[PDB]
Design a protein around this ligand. Structure first.
Ligand SMILES: c1ccc2cnccc2c1
Lengths: 18, 339
């Protein structure tokens, strides 16, 4: 599932500005 | 263009007269560090503090002048403070004091105790469409306000949206906000939320905020952003590709709104057409929204954050605490003279 893919990704924490 | 639109127009006219007065004559040096007791770090920095003379709690953003210089953020930081001290809207966090010392810049804001939308969204997974619509409507009005003042916000994301004790949103962090009547060109924002015209190094305008609204509504309703990957370059490739996939629980109205907001063609993106924000406010997905009631905070919120008392931070993550050191020598005085 796309949710499962998101949850196992490296970008589920707070995201910094570039 | 009826009576309701004329009232919005007149409201925004008065708002602009008030904004410009403060824009042209900014406030400066309205407190000092030892007016506050420092309590706890709320984000990274922003610290919870207590004002000694009143006993009020505030959120104090602290910027190290030397680090601002190294990151080439001098003008953006002057933008942030000059804009924040001049705006006034229900869904914008209020700046109460600002000042600087030898080492740091300080912006002391109203403390919003309910936590970042980010924390609640990640924990619950996703918001229902009525829930997401409630929050989205507040952003729609806030951008209508900011854009009418020639302001672009440029960093919309759940991390920057706080929930107050009434369950309503307060927008924080104006670090990339800019007042500009033409186009601008700075590569800035957060990767998941960047419009394609930013990634492709074109001139761009306030339409990037409406794209970012599209990303926000999607992330609230799906639980994950429309474009994600493990590395920023992979995110950018998805953003510029021109395709978006929706969860199967998205309503038909919601998908149609998001296809018009997440529109790579600037001549077709909602918010940027002849009807301006009214293409958004009159979309079928917003049919149940009473925009005046939202502005007046008369609509029942989806949830009220837990409140254990004054000064409690249980709706925020814990962060490592660092000293606030103030050098005996003034740093970067000329660069920040107007702050
Ligand atoms: C960052 C983190 C927490 C906050 C709480 N209240 C106001 C502003 C804030 C900014």
């Amino acid at each position: 599932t796309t949710y499962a893919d998101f949850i196992a990704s490296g970008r589920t924490g707070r995201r910094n500005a570039i | 263009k009826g009576s309701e639109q004329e009232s919005v127009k007149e409201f925004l006219a008065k708002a602009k007269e008030e904004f410009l007065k403060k824009w042209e004559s900014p406030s400066q040096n309205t407190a000092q560090l030892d007016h506050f007791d420092r309590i706890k770090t709320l984000g990274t920095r922003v610290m919870l503090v207590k004002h000694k003379e009143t006993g009020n709690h505030y959120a104090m953003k602290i910027l190290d002048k030397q680090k601002v210089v190294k990151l080439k953020q001098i003008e953006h930081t002057l933008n942030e403070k000059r804009i924040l001290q001049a705006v006034n809207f229900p869904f914008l966090v209020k700046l109460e004091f600002s000042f600087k010392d030898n080492s740091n810049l300080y912006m002391v804001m109203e403390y919003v105790p309910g936590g970042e939308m980010f924390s609640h969204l990640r924990r619950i997974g996703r918001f229902s469409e009525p829930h997401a619509r409630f929050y989205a409507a507040q952003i729609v009005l806030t951008f209508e306000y900011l854009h009418s003042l020639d302001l672009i916000y440029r960093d919309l994301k759940p991390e920057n949206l706080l929930i107050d004790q009434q369950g309503y949103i307060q927008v924080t962090d104006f670090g990339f906000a800019k007042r500009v009547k033409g186009r601008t060109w700075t590569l800035c924002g957060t990767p998941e939320y960047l419009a394609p015209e930013i990634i492709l190094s074109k001139g761009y305008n306030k339409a990037v905020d409406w794209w970012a609204l599209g990303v926000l509504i999607y992330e609230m309703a799906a639980g994950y952003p429309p474009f994600f990957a493990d590395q920023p370059i992979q995110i950018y490739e998805k953003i510029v590709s021109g395709k978006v996939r929706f969860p199967s629980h998205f309503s038909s109205d919601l998908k149609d709104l998001l296809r018009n907001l997440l529109q790579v063609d600037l001549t077709k993106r909602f918010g940027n057409l002849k009807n301006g924000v009214n293409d958004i406010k009159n979309h079928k997905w917003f049919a149940t929204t009473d925009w005046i009631a939202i502005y007046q905070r008369k609509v029942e919120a989806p949830f009220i954050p837990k409140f254990k008392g004054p000064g409690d931070t249980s709706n925020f993550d814990d962060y490592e605490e660092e000293e606030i050191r103030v050098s005996i020598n003034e740093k970067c005085g000329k660069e920040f003279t107007e702050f």
